[PDB]
Amino acid sequence: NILSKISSFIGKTFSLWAALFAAAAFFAPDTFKWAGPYIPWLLGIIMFGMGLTLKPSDFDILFKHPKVVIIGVIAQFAIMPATAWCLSKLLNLPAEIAVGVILVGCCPGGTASNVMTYLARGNVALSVAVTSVSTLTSPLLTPAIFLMLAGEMLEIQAAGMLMSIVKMVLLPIVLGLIVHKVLGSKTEKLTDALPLVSVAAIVLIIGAVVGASKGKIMESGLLIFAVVVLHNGIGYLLGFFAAKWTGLPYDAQKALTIEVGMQNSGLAAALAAAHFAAAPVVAVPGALFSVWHNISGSLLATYWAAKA
Ligand SMILES: C[C@H](CCC(=O)NCCS(=O)(=O)O)[C@H]1CC[C@H]2[C@@H]3[C@H](O)C[C@@H]4C[C@H](O)CC[C@]4(C)[C@H]3C[C@H](O)[C@]12C
Ligand SMILES: CCCCCCCCCCCC[N+](C)(C)[O-]
Ligand SMILES: CCCCCCCCCCCC[N+](C)(C)[O-]
Ligand SMILES: [Hg+2]
Numbered sequence: 001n002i003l004s005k006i007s008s009f010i011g012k013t014f015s016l017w018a019a020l021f022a023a024a025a026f027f028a029p030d031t032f033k034w035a036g037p038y039i040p041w042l043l044g045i046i047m048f049g050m051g052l053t054l055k056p057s058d059f060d061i062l063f064k065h066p067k068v069v070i071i072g073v074i075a076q077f078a079i080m081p082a083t084a085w086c087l088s089k090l091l092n093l094p095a096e097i098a099v100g101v102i103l104v105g106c107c108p109g110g111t112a113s114n115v116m117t118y119l120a121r122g123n124v125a126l127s128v129a130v131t132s133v134s135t136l137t138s139p140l141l142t143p144a145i146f147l148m149l150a151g152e153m154l155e156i157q158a159a160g161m162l163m164s165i166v167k168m169v170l171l172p173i174v175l176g177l178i179v180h181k182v183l184g185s186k187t188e189k190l191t192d193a194l195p196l197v198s199v200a201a202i203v204l205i206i207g208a209v210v211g212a213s214k215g216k217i218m219e220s221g222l223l224i225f226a227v228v229v230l231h232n233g234i235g236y237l238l239g240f241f242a243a244k245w246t247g248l249p250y251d252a253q254k255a256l257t258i259e260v261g262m263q264n265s266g267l268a269a270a271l272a273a274a275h276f277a278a279a280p281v282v283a284v285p286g287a288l289f290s291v292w293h294n295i296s297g298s299l300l301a302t303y304w305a306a307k308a
């Protein structure tokens with residue numbers, strides 16, 4: 001039973017563990033540099049877990065309230081990519097950093113936003129459906145939006161991103177969804193192992209990325225951190241006003257604020273490792289975002305849980 005309490009604590013203190021592993025990789029790169037070629041498999045395991053936990057009723061809100069889910073999807077792909085582009089222009093970021101920030105911005109939402117919405121006492125059904133739709137549509141929308149913002153010069157890289165998202169995100173989500181229909185209620189035993197396995201997989205992606213870019217973090221790490229904080233923070237701000245100005249209720253407003261600001265930044269780190277391998281700093285905005293958004297997401301959720 002102690003293993004369940006240990007898993008619960010690790011989950012409730014994720015960011016602190018992710019920050020420790022990022023620091024371990026920063027002081028000792030050779031501890032996690034071996035995980036680099038395993039990054040696609042590590043993210044694939046996380047995506048398999050999402051589909052495994054995904055049931056057909058998680059899409060009910062999409063058929064009962066299509067306009068609410070669609071506003072969420074539009075806000076995710078309009079705000080985050082535009083914010084990444086604006087900050088890259090505003091702060092005159094060097095090309096490799098700007099591409100890394102645009103990549104994070106073009107990614108779909110993160111699973112953790114579902115838990116943050118539950119803690120914020122927001123519309124959980126809406127949070128779950130927006131993440132699922134943004135993720136399922138990402139094979140086409142992530143490379144197409146990346147291509148428009150980062151520039152038509154990265155056509156080869158963006159085309160390869162479509163293939164990578166199919167292999168690391170779509171292939172595992174589907175394989176996970178079929179298992180849930182196959183085993184039925186028996187999948188609960190397999191979902192209990194998921195938090196620990198997923199945490200281990202993501203800290204290994206973070207560790208591998210930080211280790212491969214020590215020198216680049218030594219020169220631009222602080223600038224990347226400031227951009228990450230502003231990117232995620234502005235994502236909450238614009239996400240709130242998009243939910244409010246479309247006339248959505250308070251529960252939906254909290255769901256969409258978190259939805260927009262929180263990103264599948266592990267996918268961004270994976271896509272940068274696979275398509276811009278010769279430039280290790282490109283994966284850095286994604287790696288730092290995976291640590292940061294959980295900290296800011298819990299702060300915002302805590303404020304709303306205290307208010308309600
Ligand atoms: C379940 C966690 C939230 C913990 C929580 O509920 N805290 C509230 C405490 S309380 O009510 O006051 O008692 C969240 C926070 C950080 C999340 C993890 C991080 O976002 C990192 C990866 C992200 C991957 O895409 C999914 C797995 C994952 C490894 C996430 C699994 C899970 O959603 C975590 C671990
Ligand atoms: C639990 C299994 C989950 C299935 C995840 C499969 C994703 C495969 C990714 C391998 C990609 C290898 N690579 C880097 C050469 O493209
Ligand atoms: C539009 C984004 C993708 C949404 C796909 C979600 C699949 C759920 C569709 C329900 C299919 C099950 N059925 C046939 C019983 O309705
Ligand atoms: Hg701008």
Ligand code: NA
Nearest residue numbers: 113114127131
């Ligand atoms: Na969500």
Ligand code: NA
Nearest residue numbers: 109259260262
């Ligand atoms: Na998002």
